Design a protein around this ligand. Structure first.
Ligand SMILES: C=CC1=C(C)/C(=C/c2[nH]c(/C=C3N=C(/C=C4\NC(=O)C(C)=C4C=C)C(C)=C\3CCC(=O)O)c(CCC(=O)O)c2C)NC1=O
Length: 233
């Protein structure tokens, strides 16, 4: 809970330091409170220089659930990976699900070579963070060097905090190193590929059940298709 808050504030502080400013969300999607769960989900959009979209979501459902999630979409003139962060803590089962990746637009060797030196290094530094995916395809819109942990309190408390900060710093470094460097994928196709990221991710959505339980079918669907993965229908 406090750990997840610190991630949100670091990200928001970083965004602010970098000249980012808040953007309005579709009405009703910025906050939803569970009529049953005592669960609260809050979301943000940012105008971050170099990025055409940047969303953040924080779900506070006490000891039942904590979530911190964020996706960064670079401006179309950058073909570099998206940032994807999906962190869940299930208090009843003392269960951590932590996924952090630089989600690649393509799997081409040259593209992976170009962008992944930092993530490769992070992956080596935080080995406690082997897991198999049951919904997503590890070869579509994920890299080989993602941090993917299904674990417990030790991982959540001891490794995740420093790993998140390192991951975030490595993502900014990635973006900054891409400034003024030729993109190999041009803007029209970066757009197609980012939109197809939304389409893919909405198709494989592992969260609809959790969302529906807390917030109802209608809100969950709006949230998925209007905020999470806006190019999806
Ligand atoms: C507020 C938004 C949001 C929430 C709360 C969320 C929840 C959510 N994400 C999950 C899995 C997952 N989530 C990810 C990864 C990601 N998923 C992403 O949305 C992004 C950007 C990444 C980036 C790395 C992966 C790899 C899994 C495992 C699913 C699988 O087994 O295929 C799961 C299943 C837990 C499990 O695998 O045991 C839940 C309930 N997903 C969301 O999008």
């Amino acid at each position: 809970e406090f750990i997840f808050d610190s991630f949100l504030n670091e990200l928001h502080s970083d965004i602010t330091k970098r000249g980012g400013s808040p953007l309005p969300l579709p009405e009703g999607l910025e906050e939803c409170r569970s009529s049953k769960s005592s669960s609260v989900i809050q979301s943000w959009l940012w105008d971050v220089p170099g990025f055409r979209r940047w969303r953040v979501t924080r779900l506070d459902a006490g000891d039942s659930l904590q979530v911190f999630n964020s996706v960064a979409y670079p401006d179309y003139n950058y073909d570099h990976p998206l940032m994807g962060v999906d962190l869940l803590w299930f208090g009843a089962r003392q269960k951590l699900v932590a996924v952090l990746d630089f989600q690649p637009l393509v799997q081409d060797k040259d593209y992976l070579d170009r962008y992944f030196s930092g993530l490769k290094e992070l992956n080596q530094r935080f080995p406690d963070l082997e897991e198999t995916m049951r919904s997503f395809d590890p070869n579509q819109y994920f890299s080989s060097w993602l941090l993917f942990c299904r674990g417990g309190a030790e991982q959540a408390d001891l490794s995740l905090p420093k790993a998140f900060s390192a991951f975030l710093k490595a993502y900014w470094d990635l973006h900054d190193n891409a400034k003024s460097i030729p993109s190999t994928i041009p803007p029209e196709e970066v757009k197609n590929l980012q939109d197809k990221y939304d389409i893919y991710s909405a198709e494989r959505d592992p969260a609809h059940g959790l969302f529906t339980s807390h917030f109802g079918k209608d809100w969950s669907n709006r949230f998925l298709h209007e905020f999470l993965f806006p190019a999806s229908s």
